[PDB]
Design a protein around this ligand. Structure first.
Ligand code: SAH
Ligand code: SAH
Ligand code: TRP
Ligand code: TRP
Ligand code: SF4
Ligand code: SF4
Ligand code: BR
Ligand code: BR
Ligand code: BR
Ligand code: BR
Ligand code: BR
Ligand code: BR
Ligand code: NA
Ligand code: NA
Lengths: 384, 384
């Protein structure tokens, strides 16, 4: 019943049998005869199909999706963490980080800034992941409170990204919300390759919570078992060298979730500068656009999430592939009325490339011709 | 500015100079010429004054206090703990304990049972004490929420007992309440003797949070610095062999708090059966009544707290010395409408002697002629 990692050799064999040109010729709303993972791999490896042509096909295939875009802004509620992810500044061993924690007042103030000054109706709550059961339950409780508070304020969509979750931890968070509430669980697997995963997230049975690959990857299944709906798997582009392996796994994971009746967003964030203990792979724009294209094409009902990790120039090229645009900063309580968000190296998870205010970024997107759901431009008669 | 432990040799010298008979002859509202600690020690050591006669004097001296009694019922919100107190079942090393955690729903349900079925308007929230800063802040956040929730429900007095507190942890809890709210910080020093303290609470600098004697003992001063008012120091009777030492220290601590403008309750709980890793001293009823008497006499504006650690027969004899009566159970979410509270050895901090419902105990006290503030007997027209 839980997600099972696909056999990469089995998918490769199936991918050899798909007609990539026939696939591209499919009408919007038509599904290939082969599995999505196989089709994605075949499109990826068929270099006779240009990335530019693949991207155009993807944007066309996802064209009828409504709304075209919606948005949420991240709010890191703390930068404490018990884990040791080597590509992340929040790793416990990073003694150089200035550890911060948002209380009731600060979280509420941040929500109110986002709602009224940035004009957004989507928010995401983030924390580190913690080792001992009590801290995990207490974190779930606090984030559950934040989610409930955001919804009561009028936020129309709430994401959370607080590490893997077991059944009792979901129980604690769930007492704050209803089964039909617009709440999305985010748990990026980072890498579906167990060896690369261990290299960056560490070895198990030593008080490093995220090292447990299996607890993490079945978190969505526990979520769905509890009766919820919205999920957000992800791959961190730059960890594993073989992107074809990761796209097969991610598409397979999304496909599993879809089969369970889940609504899934798909995240493929690319690496950003941080206080790392191990360097990573720089993935070029072309490979990355090709990755986004095959995933978006093969999973047309599952929105890709694009964030301000990426510079303005890249957003301009890739926005057509996304279903969710998410501007913001991975610093703790970084927002302030009329000011750009803080992205201090001393306390942030990583350094983002685009620090322009969410309402400017989202305003320019709307001005360019694409409406953004869960964004209410604080302009004209809608201004205070 | 912070509390300084009195020199026991200096107090002993002063106690030798007080006229214990003249002290007993003092009118109610009149204060001895010597310090309270010295007077308490002298009364304690003057065996020509019987315990029975000392108790009568204490009950008389505290007789004009209004209200005579008020009440609160404890609610343990979790039995997780990071510390290692050797006389407590909740010590981290006790692997036999069934660890529990109350979420939003359970805490609220417990509050509603206490309010409506037991008819109480006072509640206390308790947790273990935790090591890492994030867990401490998260615990402070959750308990702050509970306190705010209780007050909103109509509770007129709220205690909390969640371990030592630093300035930032108080900040987090404080965002839930106002400076004038009826909220009492409880931090029982257990023993003011540093050696006995180390024997039971453990040695410092090894991830055992309560081992830090000094952080614990100045928690009230941080509370008062933040602008709050109500405090509750305590001694665990049975740890230190020399009760005269502990009563000098406790009375001195209460006196310090009083000088800062604080309103203080005084707790002298006696040891109860638990899953201990070190046995303790059994203190007889006479010594214990004498202890309560000299503390109550010398600190007439500071209410002693009497709890259902003690059996019914002892409450009957000692109730006249108390200003706070606190029935309940030290199990996690133990209350249930129409049923006696749970005190399961598998999950409780210790075993209490009196498990009768709070409303029965408090009802019998009122029937006997003593009103209990913050108790509304759910009877007659006040019943649903
Ligand atoms: N250096 C970096 N650059 C860009 N993204 C990063 C990054 N380090 C981590 N991330 C991404 O940020 C995402 C959410 S922040 C992590 C939340 C939570 N502690 C968890 O690990 O589940 C992670 O899933 C990871 O993919
Ligand atoms: N075995 C036992 N019998 C009776 N009281 C006990 C006990 N063990 C601990 N206690 C008391 O219960 C009180 C509150 S429960 C402890 C709360 C918090 N973890 C803290 O230690 O500060 C403690 O202060 C202690 O004095
Ligand atoms: N890193 C999280 C939260 C997030 C959303 N948008 C962002 C922009 C910048 C930094 C972090 C974010 C995610 O990708 O879901
Ligand atoms: N032990 C805490 C809480 C408490 C109040 N009344 C009790 C009765 C039984 C057990 C615990 C309690 C205290 O003495 O303040
Ligand atoms: S990715 Fe998440 S779990 Fe890993 S170190 Fe960073 S905050 Fe902690
Ligand atoms: S007395 Fe408090 S701090 Fe000590 S073990 Fe028990 S719950 Fe933990
Ligand atoms: Br649209
Ligand atoms: Br990088
Ligand atoms: Br909206
Ligand atoms: Br009275
Ligand atoms: Br005992
Ligand atoms: Br009342
Ligand atoms: Na909009
Ligand atoms: Na009453």
């Amino acid at each position: 019943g839980d997600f099972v990692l696909p056999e990469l050799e089995d998918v490769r064999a199936e991918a050899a049998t798909v007609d990539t040109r026939a696939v591209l010729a499919l009408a919007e709303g038509e599904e290939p005869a082969e599995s999505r993972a196989a089709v994605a791999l075949a499109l990826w490896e068929d270099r006779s199909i240009g990335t530019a042509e693949l991207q155009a096909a993807a944007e066309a295939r996802c064209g009828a999706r409504r709304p075209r875009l919606h948005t949420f802004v991240p709010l890191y509620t703390t930068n404490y963490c018990d884990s040791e992810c080597k590509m992340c500044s929040m790793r416990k061993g990073n003694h150089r980080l200035d550890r911060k924690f948002s209380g009731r007042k600060e979280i509420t103030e941040q929500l109110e800034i986002l709602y009224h000054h940035e004009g957004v109706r989507g928010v995401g709550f983030l924390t580190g992941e913690y080792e001992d059961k009590h801290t995990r339950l207490a974190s779930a409780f606090r984030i559950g409170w934040a989610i409930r508070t955001a919804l009561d304020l009028g936020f129309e969509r709430v994401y959370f990204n607080i590490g893997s979750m077991e059944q009792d931890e979901i129980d604690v968070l769930g007492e704050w919300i209803g089964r039909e509430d617009p709440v999305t669980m985010c748990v990026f697997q980072e890498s579906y390759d167990r060896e690369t995963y261990r290299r960056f997230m560490g070895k198990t049975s030593v008080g490093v919570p995220k090292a447990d690959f299996d607890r993490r990857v079945v978190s969505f299944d526990r979520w769905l078992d509890a009766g919820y709906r919205y999920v957000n798997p992800g791959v961190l582009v730059g960890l594993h060298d073989d992107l074809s392996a990761e796209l097969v796994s991610l598409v397979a994971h999304g496909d599993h979730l879809r089969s369970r009746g889940a609504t899934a967003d798909l995240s493929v964030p690319r690496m950003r500068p941080a206080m790392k203990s191990r360097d990573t792979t720089r993935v070029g724009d072309d490979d990355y656009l090709r990755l986004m294209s095959v995933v978006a094409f093969t999973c047309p009902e599952q929105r890709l999430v694009l964030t301000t990790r990426e510079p303005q120039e890249f957003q301009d090229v890739a926005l057509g592939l996304a279903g969710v645009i998410s501007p913001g900063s991975p610093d703790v309580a970084p927002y302030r009325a009329g000011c750009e968000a803080r992205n201090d190296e001393k306390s942030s998870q990583f350094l983002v490339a685009d620090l322009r205010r969410p309402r400017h970024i989202l305003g320019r997107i709307e001005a360019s011709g694409t409406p953004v759901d869960h964004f209410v431009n604080p302009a004209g008669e809608a201004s205070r």
